[PDB]
Design an enzyme around this catalytic site. Structure first.
Site, short mmCIF file in Angstrom:
data_model
loop_
_atom_site.label_atom_id
_atom_site.label_comp_id
_atom_site.label_asym_id
_atom_site.label_seq_id
_atom_site.Cartn_x
_atom_site.Cartn_y
_atom_site.Cartn_z
N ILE A 236 -28.63 -2.51 12.05
CA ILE A 236 -30.01 -2.29 12.45
C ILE A 236 -30.76 -1.62 11.29
O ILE A 236 -31.54 -2.28 10.58
CB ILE A 236 -30.07 -1.38 13.67
CG1 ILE A 236 -29.42 -2.07 14.87
CG2 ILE A 236 -31.51 -0.95 13.93
CD1 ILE A 236 -29.58 -1.31 16.17
N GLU B 150 -27.17 3.08 6.63
CA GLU B 150 -26.34 2.24 7.49
C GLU B 150 -26.29 2.72 8.94
O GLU B 150 -25.62 3.70 9.25
CB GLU B 150 -24.92 2.07 6.92
CG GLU B 150 -24.84 1.27 5.63
CD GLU B 150 -24.62 -0.23 5.89
OE1 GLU B 150 -23.53 -0.59 6.40
OE2 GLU B 150 -25.52 -1.04 5.58
N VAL B 151 -27.04 2.05 9.80
CA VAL B 151 -27.04 2.28 11.25
C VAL B 151 -26.50 1.05 11.98
O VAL B 151 -27.00 -0.04 11.76
CB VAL B 151 -28.45 2.69 11.76
CG1 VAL B 151 -28.42 3.11 13.25
CG2 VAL B 151 -29.04 3.78 10.87
N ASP C 10 -26.24 7.75 22.03
CA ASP C 10 -26.46 6.77 23.10
C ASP C 10 -27.37 5.63 22.57
O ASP C 10 -28.40 5.91 21.97
CB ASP C 10 -27.11 7.43 24.33
CG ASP C 10 -26.23 8.54 24.96
OD1 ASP C 10 -24.99 8.35 25.09
OD2 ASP C 10 -26.79 9.58 25.36
N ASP D 28 -41.69 15.07 12.26
CA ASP D 28 -41.78 13.65 12.00
C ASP D 28 -42.29 12.87 13.21
O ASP D 28 -41.77 11.81 13.56
CB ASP D 28 -40.48 13.08 11.41
CG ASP D 28 -40.70 11.76 10.67
OD1 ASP D 28 -41.86 11.46 10.30
OD2 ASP D 28 -39.70 11.04 10.43
#
Lengths: 252, 298
Positions: B19, B22-23, B84, B129
């Site tokens: 996504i 790095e996710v 989650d 943010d």
């Protein structure tokens, strides 16, 4: 969770170090020496006592999981301190910490060339060791110290600047000298320190009209049986420690 | 090799799809529970484990609340933070024309949002943010504040000045302020609220001067009458400042229509940080307590 980094006396007996042939007593020394190295480096690095304290708790906890036989105090102390300084918002440079560690551990050597393959190598060793500490503590880095609670207590019970000064001294020494931080919550330890400090100064805080002892306003669980038991242990180790008591001894 | 009771190997989760770029979206191998794994970046990291990750981890571990993102655990092999999984985010939903909120639902969104802010500020944390893309909405219509990697604990204070994405960054910061507090988040909350109807970030500057110009064309102009003591910023005398100029309610009059929504937004997008409404008072505003009343999400 909550009960995770607090251990029973039997749990402290069967420590990772014990499994590898370290006496109860030898292990206790290895810890006190780590706290000393941490205090020496921290003073030279000019970090706060708080950061130093935090690093001491990390070390205490780290050795409930790991053995001194596999990770030497002299290797873990610098890394723990390097980490604790970051965590307590007083980051010290990696190279800087390595340099101060070196002078403490080897006053007579001379730092290797920061270009040598052997020095680049000891930097890599610390970074690797910091990561192992984090994983051993499972990234639980927010430490509560008794000092927070001493101020609260010795203040709301109207103590001289002096009495308060002696209590902090005791709190700091309970970290260097004992594993209370592995057994009792910080609010309890604070009571233990105020208690001995009173005894040491021949001060007694008067019973309230309600019949409540001062500590019941500090921790509901605490009993005098326990207070007297712990102050006696703390006082005994302080007596075995050369010059430590001189520091609070009324010489007048 | 070395024992490790409290840090599980990330292999317990099975990687489904990239996504972040790095996710990863991933699936717990036993239960099927979907999660997001965010690797802690290690490029240019010359000082061991990144202080920025330590700080974020410190904050996430502290903040446990229905409207704040939930860190499940930290995993080793790199190191990964486990969250989650959450499918949607306010930025995605608002830039998606097929998605449509009723007034009753918008009330609920701002309500959850303000409650999240009230809570994190209560814990002496600044999010720093605030933007639509950092607001999550779960499959069950639960709003969560996310992305605390730029957050900081708070308490003359000298905090960092280049904070908050440009379009949402408050006047205070755009004037060189370093002793700011929770109000910076509320200003950002304002920019998000208005975005709930306008479907697009209301103030899209390109540089700091362009952003400050835009703010003036909306809130009137930075005036010591409007904003007591503003002229003590050295970046106020220096940088260009307009003159003449309040249009908060007219420019927004079109999209919103509802009196109350417009009144709250006027109180969020207030110039003086100290006159800007806080999370407690905002939740109390008649906007959440007049008809229609706030409703659940689907």
């Amino acid at each position: 969770n909550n009960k995770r980094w607090y251990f029973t006396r039997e749990q402290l007996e069967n420590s990772p170090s014990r499994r590898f042939g370290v006496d109860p007593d030898k292990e206790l020394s290895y810890r006190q020496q780590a706290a000393n190295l941490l205090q020496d480096m921290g003073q030279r690095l000019n970090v706060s006592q708080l950061t130093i304290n935090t690093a001491i708790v990390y070390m205490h906890r780290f050795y409930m999981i790991q053995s001194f036989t596999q990770f030497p105090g002299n290797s873990v102390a610098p890394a723990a301190l390097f980490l604790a300084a970051k965590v307590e918002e007083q980051p010290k440079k990696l190279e800087h910490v390595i340099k101060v560690a070196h002078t403490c551990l080897h006053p007579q050597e001379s730092l290797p060339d920061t270009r040598s393959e052997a020095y680049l190598q000891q930097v890599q060793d610390l970074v690797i060791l910091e990561s192992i500490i984090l994983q051993t503590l499972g990234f639980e880095l927010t430490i509560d110290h008794p000092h927070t609670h001493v101020v609260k207590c010795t203040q709301l019970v109207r103590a001289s600047k002096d009495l308060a000064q002696t209590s902090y001294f005791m709190a700091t020494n309970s970290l260097h000298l004992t594993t209370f931080s592995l057994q009792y919550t910080p609010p309890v330890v604070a009571c233990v320190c105020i208690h001995l400090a009173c005894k040491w100064s021949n001060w007694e805080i008067p019973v309230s009209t309600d019949g409540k002892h001062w500590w019941e306003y500090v921790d509901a669980t605490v009993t005098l049986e326990l207070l007297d038991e712990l102050t006696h242990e703390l006082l005994q180790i302080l007596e075995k420690t050369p010059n430590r008591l001189k520091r609070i001894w009324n010489w007048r | 090799s070395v024992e490790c009771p409290f840090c599980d190997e990330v292999s317990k989760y099975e990687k489904l799809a990239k996504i972040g770029q790095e996710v990863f979206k991933a699936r717990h191998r036993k239960t099927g529970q979907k999660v997001a794994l965010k690797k802690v970046l290690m490029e240019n990291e010359k000082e061991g484990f990144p202080i920025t990750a330590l700080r974020e981890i410190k904050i996430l571990q502290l903040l446990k609340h229905e409207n704040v993102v939930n860190l499940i655990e930290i995993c080793r092999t790199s190191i990964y933070l486990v969250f989650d999984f959450c499918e949607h985010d306010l930025a995605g939903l608002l830039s998606n024309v097929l998605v449509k909120f009723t007034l009753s639902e918008i009330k609920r969104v701002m309500q959850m949002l303000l409650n999240g802010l009230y809570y994190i500020h209560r814990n002496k944390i600044l999010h720093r943010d605030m933007k639509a893309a950092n607001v999550l909405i779960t499959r069950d219509g639960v709003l969560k504040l996310a992305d605390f990697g730029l957050a900081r604990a708070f308490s003359p204070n000298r905090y960092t000045n280049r904070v908050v994405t440009l379009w949402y960054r408050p006047p205070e910061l755009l004037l060189g302020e370093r002793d700011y507090g929770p109000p910076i988040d509320l200003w950002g909350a304002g920019c998000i609220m208005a975005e709930m109807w306008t479907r697009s970030p209301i103030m899209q500057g390109n540089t700091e001067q362009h952003q400050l110009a835009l703010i003036s064309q909306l809130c009137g102009s930075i005036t010591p009458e409007v904003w007591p003591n503003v002229d003590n910023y050295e970046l106020y005398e220096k940088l260009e400042l307009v003159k003449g100029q309040r249009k908060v309610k007219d420019r927004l009059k079109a999209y919103v229509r509802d009196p109350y929504a417009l009144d709250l937004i006027d109180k969020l997008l207030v110039l003086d940080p100290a006159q800007r409404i806080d999370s407690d008072d905002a939740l109390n505003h008649d906007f959440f307590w007049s008809d229609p009343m706030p409703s659940d999400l689907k």
